[PDB]
Design an enzyme around this catalytic site. Sequence first.
Site, PDB file in Angstrom:
ATOM      1  CB  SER A  61      -1.805  -5.197   2.846  1.00 29.84           C
ATOM      2  OG  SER A  61      -0.634  -4.221   2.771  1.00 29.84           O
ATOM      3  CD  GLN A 117       3.413   1.554  -4.668  1.00 30.91           C
ATOM      4  OE1 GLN A 117       3.964   1.283  -5.759  1.00 30.91           O
ATOM      5  NE2 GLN A 117       4.100   2.001  -3.612  1.00 30.91           N
ATOM      6  CG  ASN A 149      -2.446  -1.485  -2.478  1.00 29.19           C
ATOM      7  OD1 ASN A 149      -2.597  -2.607  -2.027  1.00 29.19           O
ATOM      8  ND2 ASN A 149      -1.649  -0.558  -1.889  1.00 29.19           N
ATOM      9  CB  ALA A 308       3.275  -3.070   6.284  1.00 25.04           C
ATOM     10  CG  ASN A 333       6.506  -2.039   7.316  1.00 28.48           C
ATOM     11  OD1 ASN A 333       6.602  -3.283   7.376  1.00 28.48           O
ATOM     12  ND2 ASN A 333       6.448  -1.375   6.153  1.00 28.48           N
TER      13      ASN A 333
HETATM   14  C1  LIG Z   1      -0.355  -3.660   1.616  1.00 26.79           C
HETATM   15  O1  LIG Z   1      -1.027  -3.815   0.640  1.00 26.79           O
HETATM   16  C2  LIG Z   1       0.880  -2.790   1.689  1.00 26.79           C
HETATM   17  C3  LIG Z   1       0.826  -1.641   0.613  1.00 26.79           C
HETATM   18  C4  LIG Z   1       1.126  -2.092  -0.837  1.00 26.79           C
HETATM   19  O2  LIG Z   1      -0.417  -0.964   0.644  1.00 26.79           O
HETATM   20  C5  LIG Z   1       2.167  -3.678   1.580  1.00 26.79           C
HETATM   21  C6  LIG Z   1       3.445  -2.715   1.745  1.00 26.79           C
HETATM   22  C7  LIG Z   1       4.344  -3.561   2.628  1.00 26.79           C
HETATM   23  S1  LIG Z   1       6.038  -3.171   2.968  1.00 26.79           S
HETATM   24  C8  LIG Z   1       6.598  -2.416   1.402  1.00 26.79           C
HETATM   25  C9  LIG Z   1       7.897  -1.615   1.524  1.00 26.79           C
HETATM   26  N1  LIG Z   1       7.962  -0.786   2.735  1.00 26.79           N
HETATM   27  C10 LIG Z   1       9.069  -0.643   3.437  1.00 26.79           C
HETATM   28  N2  LIG Z   1       9.210   0.062   4.511  1.00 26.79           N
HETATM   29  C11 LIG Z   1       3.632  -4.639   3.102  1.00 26.79           C
HETATM   30  C12 LIG Z   1       4.081  -5.804   4.034  1.00 26.79           C
HETATM   31  O3  LIG Z   1       3.120  -6.384   4.706  1.00 26.79           O
HETATM   32  O4  LIG Z   1       5.230  -6.147   4.134  1.00 26.79           O
HETATM   33  N3  LIG Z   1       2.301  -4.610   2.639  1.00 26.79           N
END
Ligand SMILES: *C(=O)[C@H]([C@@H](C)O)[C@H]1CC(SCCNC=N)=C(C(=O)O)N1
Length: 351
Positions: A61, A117, A149, A308, A333
């Site tokens: 992200s 998403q 997103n 992440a 992550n």
């Molecule tokens: C950034 O936009 C991402 C994604 C939506 O593309 C998010 C996803 C996460 S963690 C979500 C659950 N996962 C568990 N293993 C993050 C974060 O930085 O925590 N960003």
Amino acid sequence: APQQINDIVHRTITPLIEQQKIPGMAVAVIYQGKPYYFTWGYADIAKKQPVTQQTLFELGSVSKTFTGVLGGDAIARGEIKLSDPTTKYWPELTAKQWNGITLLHLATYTAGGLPLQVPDEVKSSSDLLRFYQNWQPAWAPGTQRLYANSSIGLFGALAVKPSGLSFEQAMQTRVFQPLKLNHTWINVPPAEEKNYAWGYREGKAVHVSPGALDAEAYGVKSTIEDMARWVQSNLKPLDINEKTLQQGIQLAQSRYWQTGDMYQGLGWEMLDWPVNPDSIIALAARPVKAITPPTPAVRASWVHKTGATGGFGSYVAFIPEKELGIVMLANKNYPNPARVDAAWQILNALQ
Ligand SMILES: *C(=O)[C@H]([C@@H](C)O)[C@H]1CC(SCCNC=N)=C(C(=O)O)N1
């Protein structure tokens, strides 16, 4: 590497790596405008490849900060205006819920509830149009923020339409190249694959999967060196020679909305500095107050972005008024609270 920076960095990151079981990590601290690098562990556990200053990590992200600056640059160029209706750039979006939804709403997650998403089902450009046409907002535009997103991703795709360039070509020529981010990629070239770290999820090596608007929302990969340079560029935009880019960086750090103690920029998120650490969930819907008109970038801010992928966790934060910043890239992550707590521990100490 002044001993003080070495000390705070190692004393904070060593325990972090141990508690979170992170396979590999790279950190850069920008102090008084100069970068210092630190690396630990493995980029590839199986092939015993170590993390180096050339290792590429998935930014997840944190990629949104590049989309926000590239959008700011298009604005600066006069190619688009944040006040423009989304339909001005996507005429096929005829569904009536789009009346009143502007590029500003898309860029800042305030369109009225676009989803976190894009569904995996969406592959074609046709499925994407159908997805946005059928989407039903839970709220009127500009009333609530829901990190998404599918919201900033659409913003990125539409912001480059006037240029005729693909999103990747626009990003490469307008942001990566001018800033000399020569080891930052939307798509990793075969020549650079040797440096692409593997992410680790449940002990298994994984890389991010392709998806609709992935480039625009979570698809950039980069090295600790290029990210330190990206942070320097955002810390002091005036040193950037390209006028429109200098301008876009500034626009991405303006404050458009307020939710509690945080302000929403284009990609970047900000809080007034000094900040309490404790002040810095699959879905958190939050009412927002419009900042009318937007406040220009405030030097006394903690500016940051977390990100992440299934196999990587990253965090970037900086304080313009102190010429201080940090980048933490890991191929696991791990919890966001631990990333922020580590960054604040380091920057507060160097403050
Ligand atoms: C950034 O936009 C991402 C994604 C939506 O593309 C998010 C996803 C996460 S963690 C979500 C659950 N996962 C568990 N293993 C993050 C974060 O930085 O925590 N960003």
